[PDB]
Design an enzyme around this catalytic site. Structure first.
Site, PDB file in Angstrom:
ATOM      1  N   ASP A 190      -1.190  -4.619 -17.248  1.00 26.49           N
ATOM      2  CA  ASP A 190      -1.190  -3.168 -17.013  1.00 26.49           C
ATOM      3  C   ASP A 190       0.174  -2.796 -16.463  1.00 26.49           C
ATOM      4  O   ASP A 190       0.322  -2.148 -15.385  1.00 26.49           O
ATOM      5  CB  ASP A 190      -2.303  -2.824 -16.022  1.00 26.49           C
ATOM      6  N   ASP A 209      -1.253  -4.417  -8.617  1.00 30.59           N
ATOM      7  CA  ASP A 209      -2.368  -4.181  -9.555  1.00 30.59           C
ATOM      8  C   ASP A 209      -2.360  -5.153 -10.736  1.00 30.59           C
ATOM      9  O   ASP A 209      -2.089  -4.790 -11.872  1.00 30.59           O
ATOM     10  CB  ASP A 209      -2.409  -2.738 -10.046  1.00 30.59           C
TER      11      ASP A 209
HETATM   12  N1  LIG Z   1       3.256   0.878  -1.593  1.00 30.34           N
HETATM   13  C1  LIG Z   1       2.197   0.269  -2.126  1.00 30.34           C
HETATM   14  N2  LIG Z   1       1.268   0.980  -2.758  1.00 30.34           N
HETATM   15  C2  LIG Z   1       0.222   0.242  -3.171  1.00 30.34           C
HETATM   16  C3  LIG Z   1       0.009  -1.112  -2.987  1.00 30.34           C
HETATM   17  N3  LIG Z   1      -1.229  -1.488  -3.483  1.00 30.34           N
HETATM   18  C4  LIG Z   1      -1.723  -0.368  -3.968  1.00 30.34           C
HETATM   19  N4  LIG Z   1      -0.893   0.717  -3.794  1.00 30.34           N
HETATM   20  C5  LIG Z   1      -1.218   2.124  -4.041  1.00 30.34           C
HETATM   21  O1  LIG Z   1      -2.607   2.212  -4.325  1.00 30.34           O
HETATM   22  C6  LIG Z   1      -2.782   2.662  -5.690  1.00 30.34           C
HETATM   23  C7  LIG Z   1      -4.000   1.999  -6.299  1.00 30.34           C
HETATM   24  O2  LIG Z   1      -3.790   0.591  -6.348  1.00 30.34           O
HETATM   25  P1  LIG Z   1      -4.095  -0.135  -7.757  1.00 30.34           P
HETATM   26  O3  LIG Z   1      -4.260  -1.597  -7.542  1.00 30.34           O
HETATM   27  O4  LIG Z   1      -3.150   0.287  -8.821  1.00 30.34           O
HETATM   28  O5  LIG Z   1      -5.445   0.555  -8.277  1.00 30.34           O
HETATM   29  P2  LIG Z   1      -6.767   0.165  -9.091  1.00 30.34           P
HETATM   30  O6  LIG Z   1      -7.900  -0.173  -8.224  1.00 30.34           O
HETATM   31  O7  LIG Z   1      -6.378  -1.133  -9.926  1.00 30.34           O
HETATM   32  C8  LIG Z   1      -7.151   1.435 -10.288  1.00 30.34           C
HETATM   33  P3  LIG Z   1      -5.998   1.536 -11.654  1.00 30.34           P
HETATM   34  O8  LIG Z   1      -6.147   0.191 -12.445  1.00 30.34           O
HETATM   35  O9  LIG Z   1      -6.386   2.754 -12.434  1.00 30.34           O
HETATM   36  O10 LIG Z   1      -4.587   1.499 -11.030  1.00 30.34           O
HETATM   37  C9  LIG Z   1      -1.455   2.378  -6.357  1.00 30.34           C
HETATM   38  O11 LIG Z   1      -1.183   3.260  -7.431  1.00 30.34           O
HETATM   39  C10 LIG Z   1      -0.481   2.700  -5.244  1.00 30.34           C
HETATM   40  O12 LIG Z   1      -0.249   4.099  -5.099  1.00 30.34           O
HETATM   41  C11 LIG Z   1       1.035  -1.871  -2.301  1.00 30.34           C
HETATM   42  O13 LIG Z   1       0.991  -3.034  -1.951  1.00 30.34           O
HETATM   43  N5  LIG Z   1       2.111  -1.091  -1.946  1.00 30.34           N
HETATM   44 MG   LIG Z   2      -5.833  -1.670 -11.846  1.00 30.12          MG
HETATM   45 MG   LIG Z   3      -3.032   0.744 -10.642  1.00 21.70          MG
END
Ligand SMILES: Nc1nc2c(ncn2[C@@H]2O[C@H](COP(=O)(O)OP(=O)(O)CP(=O)(O)O)[C@@H](O)[C@H]2O)c(=O)[nH]1
Ligand SMILES: [Mg+2]
Ligand SMILES: [Mg+2]
Ligand SMILES: [Cl-]
Length: 295
Positions: A190, A209
């Site tokens: 992704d 992610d």
């Molecule tokens: N600065 C920072 N932001 C993070 C981190 N982990 C997550 N985020 C924030 O949290 C959001 C969601 O995390 P993510 O793992 O992408 O989401 P998800 O549960 O997989 C849902 P999707 O697959 O649609 O992204 C990210 O877009 C970001 O804004 C990190 O270690 N650092």
């Molecule tokens: Mg995700």
């Molecule tokens: Mg994400």
């Protein structure tokens, strides 16, 4: 602040002597919510869906053990995994998310260094011996065929001719393509610019992610790098990165992105069917008309 209270409660309940002093929502998906806790920890959470956090956790563990890189990725310190509730917690990686705007303020050299950083990270991850996570295989073609069968068993017969033709035309292309027959490796899967973090010098400092990550076609990690849209940097960005990465057929990479993009409306419909969410079925069907009529 209801969601936050509930999730504070759950975090403190499942993680003994973890104390929540602050908690906010920093992101969400259709099935999930992410929180920033004590300005230090990310907690990713979801309730009943369609072994997700188990795999993602296994992948973080595998990568933290085996990658040699200065690029940071999540390192799981707290986990709770059940059918009805899954939570992953890790220290927030600090930095600024890459965007088209930011990229356009960078000097040519800065842009090159960032492209080299990306290529190097992908070369290293894709070159790992994945034996230790061999259960995390993803077969996109076979997945699509199964989704097509589900469509045929559910709503296909009620679609319009225009919708049916879009689907069948996609299935015909799926059958003729060779882009699933190449190298398989561990991919992020992704790999968009909203998952890439920059430090104060605009270098790549972190990637987040890995929730869809698995052993899959090498071409997968170039799909967003090659995308021409408002959210991504652009096709020339992905092309340059592919040249730096080396030993990959660029035209096949582009074919693979184009096929994934064509699938999107169908993927959207299938998500709606599986999750009993009519609005997704509608959105995907409407998107089929939008694409069919684009000149
Ligand atoms: N600065 C920072 N932001 C993070 C981190 N982990 C997550 N985020 C924030 O949290 C959001 C969601 O995390 P993510 O793992 O992408 O989401 P998800 O549960 O997989 C849902 P999707 O697959 O649609 O992204 C990210 O877009 C970001 O804004 C990190 O270690 N650092
Ligand atoms: Mg995700
Ligand atoms: Mg994400
Ligand atoms: Cl509908």
């Amino acid at each position: 602040a209801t969601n936050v209270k509930a999730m504070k409660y759950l975090i403190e309940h499942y993680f003994d002597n973890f104390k929540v002093d602050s908690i906010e929502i920093i992101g969400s998906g259709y099935d999930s919510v992410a929180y920033l806790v004590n300005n230090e920890y990310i907690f990713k959470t979801k309730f009943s869906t369609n072994k997700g956090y188990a795999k993602e956790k296994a992948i973080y563990n595998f990568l933290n053990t085996n990658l040699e890189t200065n690029v940071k990725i999540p390192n799981i310190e707290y986990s709770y995994i059940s059918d009805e509730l899954s939570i992953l917690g890790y220290k927030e990686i600090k930095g600024t998310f890459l965007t088209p705007e930011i990229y356009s303020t960078m000097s040519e050299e800065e842009q090159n260094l960032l492209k080299r950083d990306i290529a190097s990270f992908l070369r290293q991850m894709h070159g790992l011996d994945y034996t230790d996570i061999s259960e995390c295989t993803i077969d996109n073609k076979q997945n699509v065929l199964e989704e097509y069968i589900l469509l045929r068993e559910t709503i296909y017969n009620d679609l319009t001719d225009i919708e049916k033709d879009y689907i069948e035309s996609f299935m015909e292309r799926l059958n003729a393509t060779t882009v699933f027959e190449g190298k398989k490796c561990l991919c992020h899967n992704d790999f968009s610019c909203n998952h890439l973090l920059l430090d104060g010098n605009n270098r790549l400092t972190g990637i987040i992610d890995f929730g869809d990550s698995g052993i899959i076609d090498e071409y997968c990690d170039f799909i967003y790098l090659l995308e021409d849209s408002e959210e991504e940097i652009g096709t020339n960005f992905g092309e340059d990165i592919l040249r730096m990465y080396g030993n990959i057929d660029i035209e096949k990479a582009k074919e693979y992105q184009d096929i994934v993009e064509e699938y999107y409306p169908i993927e959207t419909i299938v998500y709606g069917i599986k999750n009993i969410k009519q609005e997704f079925i509608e959105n995907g069907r409407k998107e089929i008309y939008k694409r069919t009529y684009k000149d």
